Design an enzyme around this catalytic site. Sequence first.
Site, PDB file in Angstrom:
ATOM      1  N   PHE B  51       0.796  -1.155   0.105  1.00  0.00           N
ATOM      2  CA  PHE B  51      -0.036  -0.106  -0.141  1.00  0.00           C
ATOM      3  C   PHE B  51       0.859   1.163  -0.137  1.00  0.00           C
ATOM      4  O   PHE B  51       1.920   1.609   0.732  1.00  0.00           O
ATOM      5  CB  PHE B  51      -0.764   0.057   1.298  1.00  0.00           C
ATOM      6  CG  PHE B  51      -1.933  -1.138   1.192  1.00  0.00           C
ATOM      7  CD1 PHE B  51      -1.671  -2.466   1.353  1.00  0.00           C
ATOM      8  CD2 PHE B  51      -3.119  -0.559   1.240  1.00  0.00           C
ATOM      9  CE1 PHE B  51      -2.620  -3.307   1.324  1.00  0.00           C
ATOM     10  CE2 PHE B  51      -4.143  -1.660   0.852  1.00  0.00           C
ATOM     11  CZ  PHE B  51      -3.968  -2.787   1.273  1.00  0.00           C
ATOM     12  N   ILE B  53       0.113   5.142   0.091  1.00  0.00           N
ATOM     13  CA  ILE B  53      -0.995   5.984   0.212  1.00  0.00           C
ATOM     14  C   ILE B  53      -0.472   7.608   0.398  1.00  0.00           C
ATOM     15  O   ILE B  53       0.472   7.483   1.293  1.00  0.00           O
ATOM     16  CB  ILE B  53      -1.917   5.643   1.461  1.00  0.00           C
ATOM     17  CG1 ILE B  53      -2.445   4.338   1.398  1.00  0.00           C
ATOM     18  CG2 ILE B  53      -3.030   6.780   1.680  1.00  0.00           C
ATOM     19  CD1 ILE B  53      -3.175   4.070   0.195  1.00  0.00           C
ATOM     20  N   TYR B  56       3.180   8.595   0.935  1.00  0.00           N
ATOM     21  CA  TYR B  56       4.002   7.118   0.657  1.00  0.00           C
ATOM     22  C   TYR B  56       4.175   6.855  -0.676  1.00  0.00           C
ATOM     23  O   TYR B  56       5.105   5.826  -0.774  1.00  0.00           O
ATOM     24  CB  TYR B  56       3.713   6.220   1.647  1.00  0.00           C
ATOM     25  CG  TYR B  56       3.861   6.467   3.085  1.00  0.00           C
ATOM     26  CD1 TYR B  56       3.194   7.433   3.780  1.00  0.00           C
ATOM     27  CD2 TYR B  56       4.757   5.722   3.684  1.00  0.00           C
ATOM     28  CE1 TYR B  56       3.333   7.634   5.120  1.00  0.00           C
ATOM     29  CE2 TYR B  56       4.990   6.085   5.032  1.00  0.00           C
ATOM     30  CZ  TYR B  56       4.439   6.852   5.710  1.00  0.00           C
ATOM     31  OH  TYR B  56       4.881   6.937   7.102  1.00  0.00           O
ATOM     32  N   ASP B 137       5.148  -3.578   3.960  1.00  0.00           N
ATOM     33  CA  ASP B 137       5.140  -2.196   3.862  1.00  0.00           C
ATOM     34  C   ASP B 137       5.829  -1.339   2.891  1.00  0.00           C
ATOM     35  O   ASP B 137       6.913  -2.064   2.502  1.00  0.00           O
ATOM     36  CB  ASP B 137       5.222  -1.680   5.483  1.00  0.00           C
ATOM     37  CG  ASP B 137       4.210  -1.558   6.256  1.00  0.00           C
ATOM     38  OD1 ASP B 137       3.186  -2.454   6.092  1.00  0.00           O
ATOM     39  OD2 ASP B 137       4.530  -1.240   7.464  1.00  0.00           O
ATOM     40  N   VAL B 138       5.392  -0.417   2.372  1.00  0.00           N
ATOM     41  CA  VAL B 138       6.210   0.316   1.278  1.00  0.00           C
ATOM     42  C   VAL B 138       7.322   1.146   1.501  1.00  0.00           C
ATOM     43  O   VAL B 138       8.354   1.154   0.850  1.00  0.00           O
ATOM     44  CB  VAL B 138       5.277   1.282   0.494  1.00  0.00           C
ATOM     45  CG1 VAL B 138       5.014   2.737   1.060  1.00  0.00           C
ATOM     46  CG2 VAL B 138       5.814   1.635  -0.989  1.00  0.00           C
ATOM     47  N   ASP B 139       7.637   1.559   2.991  1.00  0.00           N
ATOM     48  CA  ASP B 139       8.709   2.454   3.158  1.00  0.00           C
ATOM     49  C   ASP B 139       9.641   1.661   3.677  1.00  0.00           C
ATOM     50  O   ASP B 139      10.568   1.958   4.943  1.00  0.00           O
ATOM     51  CB  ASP B 139       8.330   3.526   4.401  1.00  0.00           C
ATOM     52  CG  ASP B 139       7.457   2.822   5.552  1.00  0.00           C
ATOM     53  OD1 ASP B 139       7.588   3.500   6.746  1.00  0.00           O
ATOM     54  OD2 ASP B 139       6.970   1.702   5.359  1.00  0.00           O
ATOM     55  N   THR B 171       3.652  -5.580  23.304  1.00  0.00           N
ATOM     56  CA  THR B 171       2.661  -4.639  23.339  1.00  0.00           C
ATOM     57  C   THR B 171       1.369  -5.344  22.805  1.00  0.00           C
ATOM     58  O   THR B 171       0.671  -4.669  21.889  1.00  0.00           O
ATOM     59  CB  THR B 171       3.070  -3.453  22.625  1.00  0.00           C
ATOM     60  OG1 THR B 171       3.575  -3.730  21.145  1.00  0.00           O
ATOM     61  CG2 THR B 171       4.305  -2.712  23.346  1.00  0.00           C
ATOM     62  N   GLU B 229      -2.147  -4.653  13.792  1.00  0.00           N
ATOM     63  CA  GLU B 229      -0.967  -5.623  14.141  1.00  0.00           C
ATOM     64  C   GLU B 229      -1.532  -6.359  15.443  1.00  0.00           C
ATOM     65  O   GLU B 229      -1.010  -7.517  15.790  1.00  0.00           O
ATOM     66  CB  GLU B 229       0.270  -4.669  14.601  1.00  0.00           C
ATOM     67  CG  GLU B 229       1.242  -5.680  15.051  1.00  0.00           C
ATOM     68  CD  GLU B 229       2.564  -4.488  15.106  1.00  0.00           C
ATOM     69  OE1 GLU B 229       3.229  -4.434  14.211  1.00  0.00           O
ATOM     70  OE2 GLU B 229       2.663  -3.860  16.255  1.00  0.00           O
TER      71      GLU B 229
END
Lengths: 271, 271
Positions: B51, B53, B56, B137-139, B171, B229
Amino acid sequence: YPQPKVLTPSRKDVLVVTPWLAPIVWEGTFNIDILNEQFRLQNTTIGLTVFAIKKYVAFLKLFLETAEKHFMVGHRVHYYVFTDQPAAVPRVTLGTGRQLSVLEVGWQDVSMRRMEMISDFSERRFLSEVDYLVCVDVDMEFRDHVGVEILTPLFGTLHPSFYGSSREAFTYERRPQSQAYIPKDEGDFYYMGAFFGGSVQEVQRLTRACHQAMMVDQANGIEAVWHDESHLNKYLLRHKPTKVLSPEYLWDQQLLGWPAVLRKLRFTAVP
Amino acid sequence: YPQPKVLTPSRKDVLVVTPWLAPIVWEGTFNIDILNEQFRLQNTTIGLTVFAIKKYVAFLKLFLETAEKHFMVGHRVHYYVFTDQPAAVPRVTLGTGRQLSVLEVGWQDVSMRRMEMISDFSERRFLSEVDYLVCVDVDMEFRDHVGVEILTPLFGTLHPSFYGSSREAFTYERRPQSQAYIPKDEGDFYYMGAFFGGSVQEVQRLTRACHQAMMVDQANGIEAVWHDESHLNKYLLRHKPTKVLSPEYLWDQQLLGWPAVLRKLRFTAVP
């Protein structure tokens, strides 16, 4: 359950995963409570095949008594005893969810019998309810847990004479005229014929392949060096198992003692 | 190939198999030549979803250029880029056997978008030819091999902030009013949302479950602590992955350096 810790190996002394990412099953590598839950959620049924021919019918009583103490306790189990003496099978009392059937059997055709008969049997519709087949020799006893950690689509077991050996020492079939031939430079492990299994489909496929390969060898006047084991090893080289069992699963304490690397002796030769 | 040696661990510093016998994928644990042959024999096709968006979209050029150098080279790959700026996707030249499609996307509904859209997409018939889906993820950029060693029916990736942590430090969502709730005493690992995948069926099932669970939470006025997550981790606790990827596969060198236990940094954050 105790948290797995990423920076602590489960074993520091043994290889626990093959180079094609199949687990090698040793004590310390699995949490049986997790595995038991996963398999029970699928109502897993395990068929155990065993041949007991001529004088070897004498070994069925201890084999079955000890299977009932240690083999797949808590899961559905069906024993299929192949014998030429169907009336000599001992009447062993079984735990709930476990059944036994006796299949009567009628030199190279005796060498082919194990794969031929497992192949014909594995294709029958009376196995529709059975999820995995485990194929072992009878002159053995269970001494410790053998459970659902072994189940997977296809498994072999490391031969206890060879697990520490280089591949040129492996006793593969080395004549190129045999369907079981393995070149000197090839081979991952030496698997034993006394304990293999998998899902019903994968055991149909392994035993069909081994049976058909041995018939070709018979037609050509060739008997592989270690008979159906040689064919088992050519098969598992080309179709790699999805788990490999350590020699905890197939041992001979009289011949090999109880080395430190074996935390448990689960299934052993009767002396 | 070099013979695996049973009495030599593949790693002495890290856990390489989970307690339910799923491989944890580290350098040194696999022979890629064997794996490549096994997957090529099945003509394996891998879909990669990403993705990108709003701002990004700027990260797609390096993400795709570096995927072409390191992701599944030699296998069939189809990239599916989800974006609100379909006209801004850079024209990157791809190797043979690799294709790219652009899927246009139209605060809690943005939080649900990733699982909602992967779920709808994963059920389409234009995926009939695709065997595995990998969701990242893209980054990020690829810096080293990411290949067929990761493929399996269901995988997650260890979060690089937590792989060395005890479970109470994880977490997870800890409010019992949320579908993502995990009690203090439960949990195997903390998986990251930035890299998961599996077979098309298993990714249909994971994303449907996460999407449906988040819709229930939205109906009840609850947003889990770490959004999809948190739901990913509740899912992978109940449906355990069949491989777990080490943090070689998901790392941030600016924040975490290059520790000795990571022999390779394969897929990393862009600083």
